Amino acid sequence: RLVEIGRFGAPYALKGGLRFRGEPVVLHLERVYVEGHGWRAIEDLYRVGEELVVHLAGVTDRTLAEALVGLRVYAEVADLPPLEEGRYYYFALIGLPVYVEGRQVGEVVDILDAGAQDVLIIRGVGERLRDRAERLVPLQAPYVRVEEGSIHVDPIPGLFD
Amino acid sequence: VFVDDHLLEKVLELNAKGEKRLIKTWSRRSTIVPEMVGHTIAVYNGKQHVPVYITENMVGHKLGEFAPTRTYRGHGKEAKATKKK
């Protein structure tokens, strides 16, 4: 499974270096899959100002670099560095069913980084809830539980209201 | 530094009952006080109320600091990792 980790910005210098816009998870990868181009080994990577520059095998001059500008960058899920117990990749949570007292009430459609905490955006499922507004829930709230393949919430009054 | 009376009143009311209920507020300026620790406050960001589970660390900060707009879409957002639970 491929997951989007970033997107290439404009070329940097004249050796094929490419500004990388995305998650710093790219610092621990040996290769990335480039949209429309396939796997490429990461020859080098470094920082310039507030940006990160990537050097892929084959991309050795500005011209070859421009061809990749604007293209999305993907990583094999298995290549992502493992997380400590209690932490999860956004893609692993998005799409999961949400339960309240053993019953499905929704589906995670997105997660908002509120800086201190992460906020799950849940979409109702089923004719009755499918057309309500999105419901938000702090992931780190004590009344929220993450299980393999699902999320559970013990709704306090007003949470889903 | 100030706490929206309305919001504080609601919080005090809840603490006296021992209840935990989502509290909605449009006051992003109000400062977080210890009485709010353990509560879930939904702060308005202009379009939605972003829920915040108040922790000790948040005491002293402004509620707005935890309710950003969902305006920016970040590249590779799905590769982000959640803050440890």
Alpha-carbon span A82 to A25, nearest angstrom: 11
Contacts of A137 (CB under 8 A, 6+ apart): A119, A120, A122, A144, A153, A159, B51
Residue with tokens 């702090």: A138
Which residue in the set A72, A91, A158 is minimally distant from B21, CB to CB?
A: A158
CA dihedral over B18, B49, B79, A61, signed as positive or negative: negative
Residue A110: half-sphere exposure toward Cβ, Cα within 13 Å: 9
Most A CBs within 10 A among B24, B25, B53, hence the mutation to make, goes to B53
Are the C-beta atoms of residues A40 and B44 closer than 8 Å to each other?
no
Contacts of B74 in chain A (CB under 8 A): 22-23
Query: What residues does each domain of chain A span?
Result: 1-83, 84-154
Q: Is B45 helix (H, G, I), strand (E, B) or coil?
A: coil
Alpha-carbon span A26 to A74, nearest angstrom: 9
Are the C-beta atoms of residues B33 and B1 closer than 8 Å to each other?
no
Alpha-carbon span A9 to A70, nearest angstrom: 6
Resolution of the entry in angstroms: 2.3
Q: Which fold has domain A84-154?
A: SH3 type barrels. (2.30.30)
- For the residues of chain A, what is the DSSP string, one character each? -EEEEEEEEEEETTTTEEEEEE-GGGGG-SEEEETTTEEEEEEEEEEETTEEEEEETT--SHHHHHTTTT-EEEEEGGGSPPPPTT--BHHHHTT-EEEETTEEEEEEEEEEE-SSSEEEEEEE-STTTTTS--EEEETTSTTEEEETTEEEE-PPTTTT-
Contact at CB, A22 and B51, closer than 8 angstroms? no
Residue with tokens 């799409």: A95
Question: Which residue segment(s) compose the domain that B44 sits in?
Answer: 1-85
Are the C-beta atoms of residues A30 and A41 closer than 8 Å to each other?
yes
Closest CA to A138 of B52, B19, B60: B52
Are the C-beta atoms of residues B11 and B29 closer than 8 Å to each other?
no
Q: Domain count of chain B?
A: 1
Contacts of A83 in chain B (CB under 8 A): 81
**Which method, experimentally, gave rise to this model?**
X-ray
Q: What is the CATH number of the domain that holds B79?
A: 3.30.860.10
Residue with tokens 């707009």: B69
Residue A26 one-letter amino acid = V
Residue with tokens 């449009």: B26
Judging by DSSP bridges, how do beta strands A118-124 and B40-44 pair with one another? unpaired
Please calculate the CA angle B39-B43-B47 and round it to the nearest 5 degrees. 150
Residue with tokens 């935990």: B20
CATH architecture of A1-83: Beta Barrel (2.40)
Which residue in the set A94, A119, A141 is minimally distant from B78, CB to CB?
A: A94
| DSSP type of residue B36 | G
Most B CBs within 10 A among A68, A74, A132, A136, hence the mutation to make, goes to A136
